[PDB]
């Protein structure tokens, strides 16, 4: 269990990092297209 959940947490955290970077980029792409 424990090992399995730490891996899971690690894998979810990575995927979040990528999405947070994507969100930040998209929001700026949006601000430019609209400004």
């Amino acid at each position: 269990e424990v090992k399995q959940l730490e891996a899971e947490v690690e894998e979810l955290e990575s995927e979040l990092w990528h999405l947070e970077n994507e969100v930040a980029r998209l929001e700026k792409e949006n601000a430019e297209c609209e400004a």
Binding site: V2, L5, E8, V9, L12, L19, E22, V23, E29, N30
Partner: protein
């Protein structure tokens, strides 16, 4: 322990779903403005 982790795992899953939903919206809004 296993509880505390399960808890993080769950909090991470929900934040991930919210972020993919936000990303799908920005891409659609950015597509819209672009063209």
């Amino acid at each position: 322990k296993v509880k505390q982790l399960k808890a993080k795992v769950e909090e991470l899953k929900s934040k991930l779903w919210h972020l993919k939903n936000k990303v799908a919206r920005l891409k659609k809004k950015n597509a819209e403005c672009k063209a």
